[PDB]
Amino acid sequence: ISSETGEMGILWEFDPIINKWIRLSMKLKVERKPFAEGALREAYHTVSLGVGTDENYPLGTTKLFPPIEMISPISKNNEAMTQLKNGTKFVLKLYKKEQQASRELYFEDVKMQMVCRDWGNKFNQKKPPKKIEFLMSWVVELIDRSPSSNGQPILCSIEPLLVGEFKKNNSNYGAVLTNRSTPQAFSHFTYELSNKQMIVVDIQGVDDLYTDPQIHTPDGKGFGLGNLGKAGINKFITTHKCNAVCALLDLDVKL
Ligand SMILES: Nc1ncnc2c1ncn2[C@@H]1O[C@H](COP(=O)(O)OP(=O)(O)CP(=O)(O)O)[C@@H](O)[C@H]1O
Ligand SMILES: [Zn+2]
């Protein structure tokens, strides 16, 4: 939008309510060194230098992912234009040294986060002691960065900066890592209210602002490599103890 030295990116937002991706551009400036890492990715402080349209960067085609029918022809409205306005401090995440990553996985992961965000709203609507919220997430094609040896463009995901102490409350394979009730009751709520079609675990973040969740489904399909299917779900069942939040939401002690 307004520049000023940084790098260009193709910015992708998923909107669940119209079931389409919204394609934009942005400029960002990222720090050279990461400020945190996990098992898979490193996270980098970044500043936004504005969000604009994708008009200078034609799509193609010939195929494409996401496919053309999954892309909105109109991109005038989106969260990115407010949440990533010029001057915003945010987080960029890059995979560490990865051959398990594919273009399709970046998009699966961001869609997954958007799905959990809808679940957070549905939870909040039953009026629990502590409302919860999932951060937006976005796919960025770092188009100014040179493709590595394989010829693949550089991709990353971005999300807002969380301020405070970052805590993980459950894992994607049955760990209950804090004594807080809301995160565990939310996981249980997603399982029951979805009629056992899915569960949201890996509940982590700062307070009840959450990021990087994981979904399991009975058939194991979609939701990235962390979808552990029936094993994942059952592992949650084994360690769940219902709490006051579960009871308040009228969730069945039988899972
Ligand atoms: N939006 C955000 N704001 C501030 N810090 C964040 C953040 N998202 C992640 N972090 C921090 O960066 C670390 C690594 O990021 P992330 O957790 O996404 O890596 P990962 O994909 O390897 C999963 P894990 O760390 O659980 O193995 C987190 O453990 C947390 O400390
Ligand atoms: Zn419960």
Side-chain angles (χ1 to χ4, degrees), residues 35-41 91 93 135 159-160 162 166 168 212:
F35 73 87
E37 76 190 65
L40 289 130
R41 305 182 292 168
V91 178
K93 295 180 182 177
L135 294 185
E159 54 185 74
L162 294 163
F166 194 105
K168 185 173 180 150
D212 186 41

Side-chain angles (χ1 to χ4, degrees), residues 182-224:
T182 302
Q184 310 307 325
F186 171 75
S187 294
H188 188 176
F189 175 94
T190 65
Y191 190 60
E192 173 166 331
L193 276 287
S194 73
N195 281 303
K196 313 194 293 186
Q197 285 287 314
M198 58 117 269
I199 188 173
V200 179
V201 290
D202 250 352
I203 307 304
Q204 64 194 313
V206 172
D207 287 298
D208 300 295
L209 215 46
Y210 301 108
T211 196
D212 186 41
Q214 182 60 59
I215 290 168
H216 304 127
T217 58
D219 68 21
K221 304 193 199 163
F223 307 106

Side-chain angles (χ1 to χ4, degrees), residues 184-185 188-189 236 240-243 246-247 251-253 255:
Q184 310 307 325
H188 188 176
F189 175 94
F236 177 87
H240 184 69
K241 289 204 79 198
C242 275
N243 57 52
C246 302
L251 305 178
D252 201 321
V253 290
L255 284 91

